[PDB]
Amino acid sequence: TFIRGPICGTDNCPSRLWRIIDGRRTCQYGHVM
Amino acid sequence: TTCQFLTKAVLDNEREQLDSPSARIVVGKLNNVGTGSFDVLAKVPN
């Protein structure tokens, strides 16, 4: 699940944002913000 | 009727002291139904 944009709001990525409909937005290691 | 009350409400500069649940409900506080009547106070050595 990709959109590349919005890097990652975690300074040990930045790894790579996909938005789920529930709006968590999720980066690959697994921050959900 | 909101405004007609709300009007009169403002006209008196009415302070609302947050008693009725609907009031408390709006603000988002606790209620005075029951599980919110008595306050839980901890204890501690000294």
Binding site: - | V33, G34, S37
Partner: protein, 37 residues
């Protein structure tokens, strides 16, 4: 031991206590219209 408990809600009770059975159902005015009245 059967006493009421301080800090319940009867106001709601008495409301529901009237409200629910209303849903259950000279020539004086009767029923909900009378009750409404």
């Amino acid at each position: 031991r059967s006493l009421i408990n301080p800090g319940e809600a009867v106001g709601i009770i008495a409301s529901q206590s009237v409200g629910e059975p209303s849903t259950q159902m000279a020539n004086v005015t009767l029923g909900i219209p009378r009750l409404r009245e």
